[PDB]
Amino acid sequence: LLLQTNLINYVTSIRPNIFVGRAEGSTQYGKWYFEVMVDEVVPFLTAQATHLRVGWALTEGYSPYPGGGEGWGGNGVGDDLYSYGFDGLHLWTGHVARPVTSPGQHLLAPEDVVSCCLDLSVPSISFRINGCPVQGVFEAFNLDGLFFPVVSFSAGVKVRFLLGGRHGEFKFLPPPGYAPCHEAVLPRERLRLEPIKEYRREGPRGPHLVGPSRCLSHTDFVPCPVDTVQIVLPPHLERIREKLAENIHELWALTRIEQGWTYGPVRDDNKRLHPCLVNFHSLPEPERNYNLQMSGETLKTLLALGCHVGMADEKAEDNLKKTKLPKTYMMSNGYKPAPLDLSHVRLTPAQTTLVDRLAENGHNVWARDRVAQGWSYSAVQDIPARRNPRLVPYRLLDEATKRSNRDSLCQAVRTLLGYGYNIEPPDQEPSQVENQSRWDRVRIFRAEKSYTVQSGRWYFEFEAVTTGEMRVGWARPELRPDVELGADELAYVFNGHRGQRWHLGSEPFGRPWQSGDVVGCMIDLTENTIIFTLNGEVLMSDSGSETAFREIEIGDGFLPVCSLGPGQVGHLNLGQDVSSLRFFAICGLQEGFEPFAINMQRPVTTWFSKSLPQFEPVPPEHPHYEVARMDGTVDTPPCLRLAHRTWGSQNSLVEMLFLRLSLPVQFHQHFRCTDNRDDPEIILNTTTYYYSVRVFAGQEPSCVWVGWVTPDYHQHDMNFDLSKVRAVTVTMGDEQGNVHSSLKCSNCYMVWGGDFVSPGQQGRISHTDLVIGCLVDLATGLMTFTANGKESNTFFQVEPNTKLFPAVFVLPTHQNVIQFELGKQKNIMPLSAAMFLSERKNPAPQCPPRLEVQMLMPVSWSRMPNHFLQVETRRAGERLGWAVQCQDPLTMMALHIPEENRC
Amino acid sequence: EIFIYWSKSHNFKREEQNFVVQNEINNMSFLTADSKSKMARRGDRYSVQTSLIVATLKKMLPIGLNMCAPTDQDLIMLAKTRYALKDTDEEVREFLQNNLHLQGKVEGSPSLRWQMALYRGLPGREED
Amino acid sequence: GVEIETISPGDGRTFPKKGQTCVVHYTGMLQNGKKFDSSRDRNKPFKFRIGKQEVIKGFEEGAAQMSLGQRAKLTCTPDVAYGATGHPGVIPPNATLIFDVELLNLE
């Protein structure tokens, strides 16, 4: 009942920037291997045991925000279902520890070898301590997203990363088929060690608030070109089928003539004297007509892209000539330019972009073909192992290779342009790579509510390290965390990505900044004005007004605020030290303005919008949703009916909805060994509890899921189905196979309501409401379901000490959607006799006021801790590897809510 | 002092707008020339807000505010109210001579401590 | 009724015999994971005299089976613990205990 307190250590994580994953047609190899060396580990630096875990994490939900979180805080690897870790004695996943047999098992001590083997083809992560096997493997886990190495630690550890090749030694023999993780580095980026998703980093003159980080995706490793098969070849193209081939038959050969690679009559191409500028008739016929139909293939790519040709001016054939240069002179059958010669011809930017994507569609077809012959990517080239450093999609390729591909086809399109045939750009379609996660885009920052100001004149600065979508201004204290600034009336903000002022809409004002600019923000609560000054110069509106906003009502008061888009870095300076301000003396000092934090000892507390979904109660004032509590009559059990308020009207919010009850049910610590009148001697001894939901008519059962969720569910998916449900299997055996334990871990246990309706011809709007029931046995951890009073083949078994919140995910399609019925079955107790200790012997259903429906709010406010851990990330040497060092201890006082298992 | 004379001579004000209306002095370009160069109805005919005498006075005001010390703010208030009670420049000068000791004290307000710590850090400040 | 699992082995040779007091840094926990007692929080060793039973049976026997410098985990059944009456206001009745005992020194 009462909220518990404790002192806990701050726990952080560190990763190499190595990202691997599995996808259909992915250019990445499905097995990888990395090692961790333990230098020094202080046993008990503070009152709590020192934390250290090593494992793999998933890029789309492993978000280790410092401070509070799941369970008793200090979350790291294995504390959720997006990570899997090992500590020397336990296999961590979903904030549960499971013991593992090991050859001389113990916690991670100094001079220990941790080798984590990852296989993605079959789901499996294997651990090896000191080169010796560890009898436990994670299995049957979801593959969406990218898997990366990670070590989570508390203060007072020194751990080294061994990545093989020049980035380690591995000190042992990796198992066959597992490549060193250092071979997965993308060609555009180098290897370095950086923390997981963050919101602050140290800077020269102060901490930098860091917006969301752009994350690479597995879908970005599949090369998806435009198909160049179903294209009938046009007459105007077959008319020019020859010259565009003749000009690309030795164009790659032209560069190296009169050098060490100068041709000779005895040999031919690929013999270190390649050119053979004579003609392609001397060259072999198959590659010859292959080059012709490759020129045709490039024209077919032009067609599929949307390029068409038209002839206007003088024929270039007349006004073109071949130049027998002093260079490229050869003795074999006369001398000529190796491709077909061309005079002065130019190219417009439309042609530049078009040849860029033309080279893209050449590269992605080549990469697709290589993958279809089995090849994959590796930063070091291995021909007998069939791996290449250039098997990545063009967007991920390096600039050197980009330019090298673009040069040849740029010459080709130039030769096409010379003949006067138009290169027609296609239509323009604006597209967004990622659309679903609109919330993982911004990250609002603001001062704590106690610093609310209602009088005087205040000033603060905001250096713009980057030049992207960042907004800075002032906000009222009740500012919502999930709504962009200015889009509502709760904030007055200036967007200097393109020079706009936002308050209930956008209108142009001032000018956009560049790097290094210090957007100083005034405020005048007496004159009711807000003034934005850039580099000491007042930003001026497109009229006579010099103040961005005027006649602003005092109200509750105002707080300095700023938000940052993806890949943005901004320095916020409230001015705790007055001399640190760079433009206060220039502007503001003589006007009577003051810094916002002129006389304060401690740094101003900052609250940011955490992008972690949490269950929160349904507001009574909510516009679209309402929850009605129905009294339990003599023949009807008490209910929690959900009804859509604005359904069927204009501006109705119809989207994915996640619900749960406010109180959980906990299974027994120890599992057991090995009419309609209830039996009095069974109803008192039963350990089975039932609840049902009545999905009203007009709500499609294809969009309804019913069951239970554990208190660590944090998935906000707009396209939810049973596929997205996180799961993992923990497999345990002895030293030589003999698997004697295979358990299931998941944060979601629900059935899909679309599978309990008979597939009728039409009329999915059933006149009879579907009554999905759920049953639990607290003595066994077994879960069952009843579709309409008949059992279903689905069944779930869970470990003890488990907490399950009754949950329903639904997409509304009617005025009345669902109705939580808190009834009972024959010889089976209701839920109300399970959630309350004092009600354990009462068969009569109840709906006490603590029991209520809660939604899943995607974004919630949070607090930035005043001090962060000090981690050193550096490369110790070529053999030692990368060394991570954290020594100074930090402790925070955690308030843990018992029934929600979060602190 | 040019602004002082313009404020005193309301006759000079009358031909200020007369010159504006009869020469089509827009006054918007004279203040937005920097705005247009940096790539950023109601009172278009004439307005006090767009008067170039006050616009230049405002744009030069921070320099004039840089003259005095922060402890002189009481002296500014005393001189201001004596100006409001119809006194000439000599009168307020010798009034300040009678009230030379009425300056502010840094111990009495924490604001003045950081004000002096910033104001007297200027290289051009001479303590005598 | 008491089960001991090693966490970080010490010497494995010098076992706590009768006549020498035992010095420990325990860390008690309930079964569900709710920490209820610790010695590092008070920041002092817990020197308990083995033989005259100043502690419960489970803790006594578990500390007996340990070695010098060894860090171990226990599992105290209610039979060898406070039992049906529990510890009033601290431990609920019929609760299985877990201890993160470190036997840092003898006497």
Swiss-Prot record, chain B:
Cysteine pairs bridged by disulfides in the record: none
Description of post-translational modifications: The N-terminus is blocked.
The organism's place on the tree of life at top rank: Eukaryota
Location of the protein in the cell: Sarcoplasmic reticulum membrane
Free-text tissue specificity from the UniProt record: Detected in skeletal muscle (at protein level). Fast- or slow-twitch skeletal muscle.
Record text on subunit structure and interactions: Homotetramer. Can also form heterotetramers with RYR2. Identified in a complex composed of RYR1, PDE4D, PKA, FKBP1A and protein phosphatase 1 (PP1). Repeated very high-level exercise decreases interaction with PDE4D and protein phosphatase 1 (PP1). Interacts with CALM; CALM with bound calcium inhibits the RYR1 channel activity. Interacts with S100A1. Interacts with FKBP1A; this stabilizes the closed conformation of the channel. Interacts with CACNA1S; interaction with CACNA1S is important for activation of the RYR1 channel. Interacts with CACNB1.
Family to which the UniProt record says this protein belongs: Belongs to the ryanodine receptor (TC 1.A.3.1) family. RYR1 subfamily.
Chain's role: Cytosolic calcium-activated calcium channel that mediates the release of Ca(2+) from the sarcoplasmic reticulum into the cytosol and thereby plays a key role in triggering muscle contraction following depolarization of T-tubules. Repeated very high-level exercise increases the open probability of the channel and leads to Ca(2+) leaking into the cytoplasm. Can also mediate the release of Ca(2+) from intracellular stores in neurons, and may thereby promote prolonged Ca(2+) signaling in the brain. Required for normal embryonic development of muscle fibers and skeletal muscle.
Domain notes: The calcium release channel activity resides in the C-terminal region while the remaining part of the protein constitutes the 'foot' structure spanning the junctional gap between the sarcoplasmic reticulum (SR) and the T-tubule. Pore opening is mediated via the cytoplasmic calcium-binding domains that mediate a small rotation of the channel-forming transmembrane regions that then leads to channel opening.
Note from the entry: Binding of [3H]ryanodine indicates that the heterozygous channel is activated by Ca(2+) concentrations 4-fold lower than normal. Single-cell analysis of cotransfected cells shows a significantly increased resting cytoplasmic Ca(2+) level and a significantly reduced luminal Ca(2+) level.
Protein name: Ryanodine receptor 1
Source species of the chain: Oryctolagus cuniculus (Rabbit)
First and last residues shown, out of full length: 3440 to 3585 of 5037
From Swiss-Prot, chain C:
Keyword Transferase: no
Assigned keywords, A-Z: Cytoplasm, Isomerase, Rotamase, Sarcoplasmic reticulum
Tissue expression profile of the protein: Detected in heart muscle (at protein level). Isoform 1 and isoform 2 are ubiquitous with highest levels in brain and thymus.
Enzyme Commission number, as recorded: 5.2.1.8
Listed name of the protein: Peptidyl-prolyl cis-trans isomerase FKBP1B
Gene Ontology MF: a single term: FK506 binding
Pfam families documented for this protein: FKBP_C (PF00254)
EC main group: isomerase
Activity control mechanisms: Inhibited by both FK506 and rapamycin.
Record-linked Gene3D superfamilies: 3.10.50.40
Function: Has the potential to contribute to the immunosuppressive and toxic effects of FK506 and rapamycin. PPIases accelerate the folding of proteins. It catalyzes the cis-trans isomerization of proline imidic peptide bonds in oligopeptides.
Cystine crosslinks: none
Subcellular localization, as worded in the UniProt entry: Cytoplasm; Sarcoplasmic reticulum
Assembly and interaction partners: Identified in a complex composed of RYR2, FKBP1B, PKA catalytic subunit, PRKAR2A, AKAP6, and the protein phosphatases PP2A and PP1. Interacts directly with RYR2.
InterPro entries: FKBP-type_PPIase, PPIase_dom_sf, PPIase_FKBP_dom
GO biological process: 'de novo' protein folding; calcium-mediated signaling; insulin secretion involved in cellular response to glucose stimulus; negative regulation of calcium-mediated signaling; negative regulation of heart rate; negative regulation of insulin secretion involved in cellular response to glucose stimulus; negative regulation of release of sequestered calcium ion into cytosol; neuronal action potential propagation
Stored PANTHER family: PEPTIDYL-PROLYL CIS-TRANS ISOMERASE, PEPTIDYL-PROLYL CIS-TRANS ISOMERASE FKBP1B
A Gene Ontology term for the protein's cellular component: sarcoplasmic reticulum membrane
Span of domain PPIase FKBP-type: 19-107
Family: Belongs to the FKBP-type PPIase family. FKBP1 subfamily.
Catalytic activity: [protein]-peptidylproline (omega=180) = [protein]-peptidylproline (omega=0)
